[PDB]
Amino acid sequence: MKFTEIFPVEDANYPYSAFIASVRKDVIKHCTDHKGIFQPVLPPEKKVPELWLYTELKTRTSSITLAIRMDNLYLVGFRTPGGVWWEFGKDGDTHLLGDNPRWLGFGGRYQDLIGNKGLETVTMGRAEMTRAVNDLAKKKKADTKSKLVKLVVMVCEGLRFNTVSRTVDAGFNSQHGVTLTVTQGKQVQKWDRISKAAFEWADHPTAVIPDMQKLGIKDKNEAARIVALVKNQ
Numbered sequence: 438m439k440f441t442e443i444f445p446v447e448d449a450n451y452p453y454s455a456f457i458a459s460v461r462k463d464v465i466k467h468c469t470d471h472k473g474i475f476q477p478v479l480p481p482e483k484k485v486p487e488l489w490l491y492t493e494l495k496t497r498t499s500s501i502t503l504a505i506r507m508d509n510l511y512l513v514g515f516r517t518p519g520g521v522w523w524e525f526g527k528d529g530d531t532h533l534l535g536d537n538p539r540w541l542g543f544g545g546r547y548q549d550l551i552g553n554k555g556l557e558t559v560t561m562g563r564a565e566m567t568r569a570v571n572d573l574a575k576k577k578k579a580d581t582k583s584k585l586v587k588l589v590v591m592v593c594e595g596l597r598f599n600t601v602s603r604t605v606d607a608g609f610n611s612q613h614g615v616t617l618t619v620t621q622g623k624q625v626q627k628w629d630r631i632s633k634a635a636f637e638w639a640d641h642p643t644a645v646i647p648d649m650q651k652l653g654i655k656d657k658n659e660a661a662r663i664v665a666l667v668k669n670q
């Protein structure tokens with residue numbers, strides 16, 4: 438239950454880099470040092486998550502609160518200014534949130550938000566993220582998918598990958614915005630697997646793992662500079 442330092446998205450005086458930095462520091466307070474594994478290993482998964490990361494994003498005009506589960510740096514939902522909670526999911530699923538919330542209608546996976554398509558297409562940046570927040574706070578009750586998917590890569594994958602927090606910070610104030618490279622996306626969509634190989638590599642640092650080979654990742658060394666935070670078991 439750690440509340441994140443507010444991130445003034447519209448205020449160009451705050452870097453994207455600090456936001457991330459600040460958050461990981463918070464997150465890490467809860468990770469464990471595993472042998473042979475470079476990166477801090479996240480809290481172990483539980484059907485009902487224990488530790489949560491409440492990270493609010495505010496603009497000149499509005500703000501929303503992000504509900505992310507630590508165990509796997511996944512965005513479970515958000516909060517509108519008026520105190521309403523939207524959770525990824527359909528009627529019948531089980532809730533994890535947080536004060537009477539209203540199933541968003543769709544899950545929060547890439548296939549769900551933009552199936553068959555690659556992260557290289559989701560455009561991101563301070564602007565895009567400002568557009569996103571304001572737009573998502575003006576929500577009552579599907580172009581709020583394209584809005585969530587930006588925050589998903591910007592915030593969630595930014596927390597998970599150095600490779601993302603670097604390409605995003607570098608192009609955050611770009612007019613044309615910033616997008617990941619084909620390869621990055623693929624890699625980003627394989628967080629789960631890279632992580633598993635981080636464990637595999639702790640045991641056999643030598644083992645060649647075609648899945649990582651197939652992603653442009655040679656060894657545990659290369660993966661270490663890509664992923665910041667790892668997963669499980």
Ligand SMILES: Nc1ncnc2[nH]cnc12
Nearest residue numbers: 510511512545546547593
């Ligand atoms: N909603 C989400 N939050 C964090 N990471 C994700 N990867 C795919 N969907 C995600």
